[PDB]
Design a protein around this ligand. Structure first.
Ligand code: HEM
Ligand code: HEM
Ligand code: HEM
Ligand code: HEM
Ligand SMILES: Fc1ccc2c(-c3ccc4nnn(CCN5CCNCC5)c4c3)c[nH]c2c1
Ligand SMILES: Fc1ccc2c(-c3ccc4nnn(CCN5CCNCC5)c4c3)c[nH]c2c1
Ligand SMILES: Fc1ccc2c(-c3ccc4nnn(CCN5CCNCC5)c4c3)c[nH]c2c1
Ligand SMILES: Fc1ccc2c(-c3ccc4nnn(CCN5CCNCC5)c4c3)c[nH]c2c1
Ligand SMILES: C[C@](N)(Cc1c[nH]c2ccccc12)C(=O)O
Ligand SMILES: C[C@](N)(Cc1c[nH]c2ccccc12)C(=O)O
Ligand SMILES: C[C@](N)(Cc1c[nH]c2ccccc12)C(=O)O
Ligand SMILES: C[C@](N)(Cc1c[nH]c2ccccc12)C(=O)O
Lengths: 346, 345, 342, 341
């Protein structure tokens, strides 16, 4: 067993055919463009491998055994460490000038990155919605794909996504039981009370621009906080695709946020953090890719379509980010005395 | 022409065979170990491509046309930007624990990174000298290689290296002509004079320990500076492999250092800078690789690898060491436009 | 001379007062928020130092001596290396959760990053135009400032910007002389010819492929010939959608196309670095936005989002020269006979 | 409350005095040298803040409540994220050439980085031992310091270090009870047995490969059984080739092997981050060395000496890789017997 055989370098290092050279006009920088993409694809394959393994742990019920949370968080962390490198890797392609790219661009048409099967598979498996995908020149993405490739794409759309598997798991989060710790009920009450207290305070002040300013802020804060308990408004925002998680999953997430220090919630909290990281880094990748298309082609547009992809429309875990909106004073958080805490001890 | 076909992904993405899985005991993290190395190898191929192209520009005489310096510096800069990423890429493999590596390590024997053809090609093409290589288990690196692989490795040793091609170019550096600007002559004189000036200054100082200290410093500095003009000392240090550039090439390098702002030397100065960067980053790569072997295998190969993290493997150590011979600006032989013109484009 | 004294650490390391602690409720992570910003400010001061030195080299005429180009490009490169680090530095503040930030946010009012004098000075000195700024809360940015600070900000708007100083230098680029190499004239002719030649080719099959190629030719011709429309340029200048004078634009394109010619090698690197600085400034604004979102939720967020736009790209014209790339063989030939001038 | 006042920028941004300018020969690049160091010092202060807060959580007994492990690991992770940036920050000073540094170097004498109080405080608070310090010609690293500065340095050496506080905590790791899961006993037995089983295998082999395997076996056997030699450990402790008590070492290995068990998941991450901090500290030392070399040529060798295991405080955690065994040799922890975890 030799290194080169183990790594099948007979394949990996015999995969560089410059179209410029095939058409009798070799252009040096084409080689860089080929290798950069091959490297992106190697790492996309590794991301798919980690992500598929984590999806499986959820789908098959292994995640139910909390012994497996360390593995889940390590692999999701690994996904983000890979993505950070993928973002840095753009700096290599920045060493190619547009004038140099212009010397071989002709020999590439009509190929495009759009045809990256694995990038699409990755978007789908995380949880990007087709309905929300931005049309490129009034066209569907899968239009450019055929055969078994079109097949794999379909499975990726139809199989349970990371978002859905996390949703299901969040729905079973301990503490939501109305007959138990009754998190949601206690939270509603504590916030309603606290708002009442606060209003009384402000109402006791004397008419002024200040008082109005405080009253106005209060009203805004009140509306945001109480909207959390409006299950119907949530259902509505779900159907418009401005939210992604079920109402119950949202309750589980908030439970984990507020009780993160409780032992059973420590690693779950880290998982939520890494899911947000993955969304952020995916968006950073899209951003750096856009900046590059611009530098090479100008405003001539793919640039604008790609710019549209840099939006909340492509953020699968938007709901986890938006739990910042619902931050309250610590003393309003339902108290969990050891009496009612033992259920969250390893 | 479709993306996947253009990039031959039918090969690149059908090259991942976990030996753990082939022997009926798939271990998840083996997949990462394979991909990481495949990625290193893709980028080694790219470095070889740039490096070979720059070597050719020198070997074929194209570098004589100063129009080509921009291309040479961009490609060498590109080599160092790739190497920066190769160093960061270790952080991916740091997400694998030793315990998890231990579950598939058995299925890897007897394969090793040592058998990386391209890493050897890269060391050779830059200019690592065989005689200065540290033996691993009392053997040449080029054993463990056979057939056309052994062939490629030979060519890489026998063809002109980047070190040799740079040396040749440095020897032709403008300004070294005794009949012209006579840089070396003027430099020797100006330093001899400046040292004299300095001695007088210190000798004037009131008897005091500071004076005593400064006397000591002066003596050391004087010895270092004058040793520059000792061509025989240089020949000796060449034999011991503590220097690699010819005496004349060293003169050319120092010319470019001191006159870097002069238009014809601006991009050449950047080239020298990038050559040092490449050596720095190669040794950072070796260092990070060692730290990783340690974390996975504990404290043999470790010690061999530790020996690789040394000036013995820095091809352009001479460019770094020109810091030793820095002088006050006012000692640098003057180049008024009168004697400037030869360095304007 | 001792390290601590040389670096005036008696000041730098006695500058951390947690407002949470001053009001009797110390919150651990406030310390990090203070240090992060102090570090950003140290680096902004260094950027200002390099940038002011480069502006001086232009304004005083030193740049006319081409021996100074290495210094100019090194310092501009150094600006972008600093900015790369400023972008990475956000990852430190990402270790603070929103819940933890929430515990000391109250004690910060009414202070904001908006009030960073140095950040504004930097925007102004590069060449961000006030009239092109996005209003904050329906008002001008400088209204948030007072006294000598408001005055410094004005000088920064009125004194020559890096954009203006580069523009002047670009205007004197060798080769534009109609009586000389006549770059613009030759270029117009060669593109007119080359377009025709393309037509002749495309004139010959009737497939959609042909139709597609014909379609491309149309815009390509439109884009390329629009380059020679000086009036359209003047119009886009007044709307602020371009920044450089028509002549400066000619100089830049001269440098792009002839970058390998010795006199243009380091100038080409300067143009590259100016684009880098714009790109990295934008990356900084982007990462800052992503972080405000993570800490505050969904709004300054929307104002900040508006700053991530071409409106704030001072050297947009250098980026846009990609639009006007032609085949190499169309580029006016400069044989050594004439190449000697460069 | 205004930004500049909140951040006391009247101090931070009025702290840049170029000695080149003070002596009538301003050198542009000196400004960068000053700011770079000031930035390093701001971040060293932040590292000290996090590290001191973590040391407190151990010393005051809060670490006993496992609810606090998330905070402990977050702050140690934060230390590493800062150090990663400190390593990247060298790339800024690499934009200064040695020729340009040479134009103001004279005006610095005799000041040196050696005089960084905070860097010393950081080394000490982690657990770098004075007795293990590499002498700089005349030793006396603390002798470069005086006054309340010399005072602070002393406290930093004498107060409990991160190493010592972690050691104490590792000693209380659940599972080491002889009357309980009896980790050490079971481990010794399982390895002794497994080695015997291996002997039979190699015995049944029948040329060279056998020779190869037998040789390896002997080495592996020696390494593994040396783990159970408490006296050898005590000896290596007194030399300074190990740092953790024998019992702490047992706790660490418990956490390594049972990392997936819920009570050990975050503790395992803590051990990982302690190793990370050691790694990154030594990366910092390495990049600093490479730069002194580029600027001065030939402290290079002294600084090179600092890049050694001699300066790795958590060397014991790294070295537990040496004692990896097959998974099936690890004492089994059935639900019944992992209830405690
Ligand atoms: C010279 C550098 C690059 C240029 C000029 C470029 C150009 C483009 C353009 C114009 C598009 C929009 C679709 C189209 O018009 O055909 C696009 C999309 C895409 N490119 Fe690139 N690209 C570059 C580098 C890369 C790299 C390094 C990757 C890495 C795999 C990549 C992957 C993609 C992907 C996946 C898409 C589809 C993204 C989406 O639809 O959201 N490209 N590229
Ligand atoms: C788990 C991670 C790794 C381990 C444990 C490891 C182990 C080793 C060891 C022990 C050696 C010395 C030769 C021997 O006895 O086998 C070696 C050398 C080498 N490794 Fe690695 N390695 C790792 C990762 C990598 C990676 C990511 C690369 C990337 C290509 C690589 C490339 C090499 C090369 C080229 C050599 C020969 C270097 C020289 O002779 O100076 N290794 N490795
Ligand atoms: C918790 C972290 C941060 C939050 C929540 C935050 C929040 C904000 C907000 C809301 C604004 C809009 C103005 C306002 O309404 O106050 C703003 C602007 C700004 N922040 Fe931050 N910021 C953070 C970190 C930073 C840091 C680390 C810097 C570093 C110097 C910074 C510099 C600025 C600057 C310069 C502006 C003005 C930007 C412009 O107008 O284009 N901020 N920030
Ligand atoms: C031009 C760049 C630098 C040079 C030439 C330089 C030079 C040196 C030298 C020669 C030493 C050994 C002690 C001595 O002989 O004085 C040293 C130690 C030290 N330097 Fe630097 N240094 C540089 C940059 C930095 C930076 C950026 C830091 C960041 C704070 C720093 C912090 C230190 C520290 C803490 C030590 C003592 C560490 C130890 O003893 O292991 N230096 N430096
Ligand atoms: F393997 C690859 C191959 C090509 C690319 C590109 C890319 C970037 C800029 C381009 N300008 N023209 N073309 C030709 C393609 N036509 C433009 C619109 N889309 C399809 C028709 C381009 C292709 C980006 N990544 C690639 C990967
Ligand atoms: F494609 C690959 C495959 C394997 C590696 C290794 C590597 C790392 C640690 C190891 N421990 N045992 N073995 C296997 C046997 N070795 C033979 C050479 N002398 C050391 C023992 C190892 C192989 C590093 N890079 C690789 C790349
Ligand atoms: F040195 C510093 C000090 C503070 C900050 C902030 C920041 C971040 C979030 C905030 N939420 N409320 N406030 C108070 C500011 N008022 C409301 C928002 N508009 C301005 C008036 C905030 C201030 C960001 N960077 C800072 C740096
Ligand atoms: F705030 C600061 C000030 C200075 C430094 C240095 C530094 C780097 C190179 C030097 N060469 N000579 N000197 C003067 C000091 N003498 C030689 C070295 N040992 C002590 C006597 C130097 C000082 C590094 N970091 C610094 C920080
Ligand atoms: C038994 C369980 N693992 C419980 C569970 C669900 N979601 C959680 C989030 C945090 C902590 C625990 C849970 C399961 O049902 O998967
Ligand atoms: C014409 C030339 N390339 C001169 C030359 C050689 N080395 C240099 C370094 C810097 C500047 C110029 C040169 C030659 O003789 O090859
Ligand atoms: C003499 C000159 N340096 C000419 C000049 C202007 N812009 C340029 C761009 C590239 C090369 C040269 C120039 C000057 O007038 O500044
Ligand atoms: C009660 C205890 N937290 C026990 C303890 C010590 N070390 C550990 C490691 C992992 C898990 C638990 C421990 C204490 O006394 O610290």
């Amino acid at each position: 067993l030799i290194y080169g055989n183990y790594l099948h370098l007979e394949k990996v290092l015999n995969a560089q055919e410059l179209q410029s050279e095939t058409k009798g006009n070799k252009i040096h920088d084409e080689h860089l463009f080929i290798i950069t993409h091959q490297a992106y694809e190697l790492w996309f394959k590794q991301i798919l491998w980690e992500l598929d393994s984590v999806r499986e742990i959820f789908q098959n019920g292994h995640v139910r055994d909390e012994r497996n949370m360390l593995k889940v968080v390590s692999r999701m962390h690994r996904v983000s460490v890979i993505l950070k490198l993928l973002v840095q890797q753009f700096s290599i392609l920045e060493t190619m000038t547009a004038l140099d790219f212009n010397d071989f661009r002709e020999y590439l048409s009509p190929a495009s990155g759009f045809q990256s099967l694995q990038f699409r598979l990755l978007e789908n498996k995380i949880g990007v919605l087709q309905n929300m995908r931005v049309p490129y020149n009034r066209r569907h993405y899968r239009d450019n794909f055929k055969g078994e490739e079109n097949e794999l794409l379909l499975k990726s759309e139809q199989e349970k996504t990371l978002l859905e598997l996390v949703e299901a798991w969040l729905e079973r989060t301990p503490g939501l039981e109305p007959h138990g710790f009754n998190f949601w009920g206690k939270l509603e009450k504590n916030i309603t009370r606290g708002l009442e207290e606060e209003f009384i305070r402000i109402q006791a002040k004397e008419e002024s621009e200040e008082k109005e300013e405080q009253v106005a802020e209060f009203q805004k804060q009140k509306e945001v906080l109480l909207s959390l308990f409006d299950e119907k408004r949530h259902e509505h925002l779900l159907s418009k695709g401005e939210r992604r998680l079920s109402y119950r999953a949202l309750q589980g997430a908030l439970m984990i946020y507020f009780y993160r220090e409780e032992p059973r919630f420590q690693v779950p909290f880290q998982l939520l953090t890494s899911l947000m990281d993955i969304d952020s880094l995916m968006t950073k990748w899209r951003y750096n890719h856009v900046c590059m298309v611009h530098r090479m082609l100008g405003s001539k547009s793919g640039y604008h379509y790609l710019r549209s992809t840099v939006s909340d429309r492509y953020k699968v875990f938007v709901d986890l980010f938006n739990l910042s909106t619902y931050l309250i004073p610590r003393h309003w958080i339902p108290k969990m005395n050891p009496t009612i805490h033992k259920f969250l001890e390893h």
